[PDB]
Design a protein that fits this description.
2 copies of one chain form a homodimer.
Chain A (H helix, E strand, L loop, with lengths): L4 E4 L9 H16 L3 E4 L11 H14 L22 H13 L3 E4 L4 E4 L6 E6 L3 E6 L7 E3 L7 H11 L4 E5 L6 H11 L5 E5 L19 H7 L3 H9 L14 H6 L15 H13 L3 H14 L3 H8 L9 H5 L21 H16 L6 H15 L3 H13 L7 H8 L1 H14 L5 H13 L6
Parallel strand pairs in A: 1-2, 8-9
Antiparallel strand pairs in A: 3-4, 4-7, 5-6
Helix pairs in contact in A: 4-5, 7-9, 13-14, 13-17, 15-17
Bound molecules: O5'-(L-glutamyl-sulfamoyl)-adenosine (GSU) (2 copies).
Chain lengths: 456, 489
Amino acid sequence: TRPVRTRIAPSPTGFPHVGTAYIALFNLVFAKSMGGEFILRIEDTDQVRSTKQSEQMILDALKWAGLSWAEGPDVGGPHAPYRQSERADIYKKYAEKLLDDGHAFRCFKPFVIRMRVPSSGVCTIKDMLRGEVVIPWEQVDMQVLLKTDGLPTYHLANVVDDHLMQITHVLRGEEWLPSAPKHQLLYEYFGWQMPELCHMPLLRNPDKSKLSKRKNPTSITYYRDAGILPEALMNYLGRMGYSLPNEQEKFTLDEMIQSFDIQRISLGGPVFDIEKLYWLNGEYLRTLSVDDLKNKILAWASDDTKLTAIARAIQPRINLLSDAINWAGFYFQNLPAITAEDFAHKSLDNEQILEILYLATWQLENLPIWSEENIYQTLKGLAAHFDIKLKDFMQPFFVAIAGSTSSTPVMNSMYIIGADMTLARLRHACEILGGLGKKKLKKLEEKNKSLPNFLA
Amino acid sequence: GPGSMTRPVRTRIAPSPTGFPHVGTAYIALFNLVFAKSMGGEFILRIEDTDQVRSTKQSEQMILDALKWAGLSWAEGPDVGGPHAPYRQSERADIYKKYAEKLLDDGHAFRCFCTPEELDAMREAQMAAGLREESDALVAQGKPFVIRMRVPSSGVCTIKDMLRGEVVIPWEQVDMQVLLKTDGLPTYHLANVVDDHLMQITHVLRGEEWLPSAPKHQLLYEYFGWQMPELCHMPLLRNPDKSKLSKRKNPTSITYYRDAGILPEALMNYLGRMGYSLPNEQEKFTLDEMIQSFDIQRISLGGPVFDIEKLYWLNGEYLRTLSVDDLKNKILAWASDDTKLTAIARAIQPRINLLSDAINWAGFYFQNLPAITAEDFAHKSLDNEQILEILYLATWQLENLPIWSEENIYQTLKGLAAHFDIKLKDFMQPFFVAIAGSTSSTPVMNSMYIIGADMTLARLRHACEILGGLGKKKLKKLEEKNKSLPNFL
Ligand SMILES: Nc1ncnc2c1ncn2[C@@H]1O[C@H](COS(=O)(=O)NC(=O)[C@@H](N)CCC(=O)O)[C@@H](O)[C@H]1O
Ligand SMILES: Nc1ncnc2c1ncn2[C@@H]1O[C@H](COS(=O)(=O)NC(=O)[C@@H](N)CCC(=O)O)[C@@H](O)[C@H]1O
């Protein structure tokens, strides 16, 4: 055959997603079972949305989960650079070869290169799991390969980098199956061998919808912060679309590798029941030594939360070393115990309060960098646009973030617990307060886009 | 002034190791240490374990550890050694016997074939308003005797106080104190004079409670032909209500404030301010600053009040003057040392499904006094007046435990529930709230073992205060029952 080589190719656009870890697990397990290697390629082709910080978050998140790669942006490799943004020169020449070869045309002076697509026939793709995929060529668009800025699109860079990095198997979400005919065609146009394709079912919520941050948290780093062990999380993800022989519910990475058979992957959309993940974490915690449990609690508290920042926040308010527990306890909880009645709506109407927390969630979600200043500018700008006094605007945030009406300055608190935990606590607060109906929620999303950029 | 001293200055703290180390012992130790260092002299420690039934080896280590934590240190003592070792009175029994006999030979002490409890009956005897070869023969017969000191029947005693001037006490008010007991071991009064003379103590600062005993000590120094040390009687620390410092309102144990999060520097700063004020009225100062500007005459004689709230505020001032980095390290060090985390992890493991739950289950281990209300204890099965009775007896029984070990806590509480014929499940219901602040928590008896003796007792007495306590009359009945109870161990 040929040396097996798999990959995870995360687009560093936003929070590190559990789904990205789901795919990363099944690519690493597949490779190792076949004596191959697992590499990581950062796909930062969306220049405006891809951030250097978001790249470091994903590498840190997967390393924490226990995944590792033989070649990548950090470790290096014979196929460096491993960021697509630093491969811009490579893609341009191949796109020009597609123009000379009679396989691409320009569409409008500013120009974009587009691929030629057959006008009649079918595309037959072999999926390792679903069998055979047939797609009419007429339902395949003439996708843009090189943009006006000279930078690549996803479809061009994936084919060039997979071929140059000698990828032999690609496992990715079934969302990318409609793009597969484009990929076969590009490999033919370049005279290259297309890797074998296995499309994976997409993780779902309990309501059978697609996994959404709305219904259940979706960030890898949130589960770190909430107290989930990385060994438990990876165990749960390997159990989602897949079952080990004999239906073992708790297993290690090495156990998954040895008995790994791609055909055991179910096609139903796996449901990410956070409660079942929590129980499994309980099993991992109870099978630990008391010494190990102690050391794991201390490490979980020394790394995620910054203690020098917690000390500075509580110093004005503690008169005894024993007060630290009552003033800094919420920094180490997951979701403070709150009730609807706690939001006294004495300054703001309850319907107002919901609108403040929803808009604050979305605005804080898209922050380029999680700094106390960016939090302050965003929340001050939001209170400015609606003409509410800031102290009255922040009243709900004391309840949602700290679980009490009195605490250290809530904005430094949000900076300390982090982006993932702040948003998890805001979304929880909306749910306790009943949320807003589908009709009201869409209207509020409209205003969110009409809002200014509170940081420009 | 240091130069106007006849002899090298030497002070002392002489704690009786008969329970938890009390803040008062730290107060006195501070002013003897500061006085000595100010005069170029030395501070020593002598353990006064003459009450054998009440003195514990554990209690001796408790005081030495407590004073070292507070920042006190001594040039000579049971641990460091010294030219006048041993520094435990229990190991100086030989010395006291001979000096007690010398007082018999000089005719300054007499033998009484009474025994100390019989003597108390003799002194209580009713009498009208207006009023030895045989003893040696009784010594041959082996009858038990106690040596007693002779006291003049008429006249006055003038005691020189460094602060009060001259204190005059009619000799009629001075009893013929026992110097040697039936066992041949010393009493406090004989051992103090003999040891102070032998350890070359030049100044003695001690509570004003000992002022009535001063005439006796002056008399013994005369009988031995020894120079009496100068006496400076210190005002006694008081409660906010102006009573003598009592455990009811606030804990009196040095180690409780360590466990509660008071820094040692803040506690010594507060104690240095109680009867005394630095020049220029600095409210916050270090030990060395106190030494440099120390003047014995600045000690006020009004009873200082030990306001726990003011101690807490001063501790806050110490916390704010720390760098954020130092405050971090001090909080962590305070939590790693006293409580062992391996036991807390053991306790929460059966109950936590997330690492984040650890904070909610183990928070009470690091709190000082959990937030409690009367209503928290009452939706249970037991009447409040019962609950109060359970907590008071549990406090006293757990206080007198020889060792703080989970089995001893278990035997004590199980026997108490047996004597009341209350089921253990209902008997422990109040202790869950008093120790953890909730109806559901880790097993409370392991919890009490972990937080320690001081914190367990502080939280139980607090539980009594919120529940209103028991009246003075109700409390007397309960103390009677406490002694009538069997040994639950
Ligand atoms: N709910 C879900 N359940 C399960 N898998 C899910 C998922 N959402 C996304 N994925 C899958 O996660 C992987 C990485 O996602 S991602 O960062 O958005 N990057 C991308 O989608 C592209 N870089 C795809 C590259 C490729 O695979 O060829 C991709 O393989 C993507 O299909
Ligand atoms: N509330 C209070 N405020 C302030 N000082 C107080 C105090 N209660 C006790 N003291 C003082 O503490 C010192 C040691 O106390 S103790 O362990 O009971 N030992 C004794 O009283 C004697 N063995 C001391 C002998 C001596 O000094 O000559 C003794 O000096 C004692 O007077």
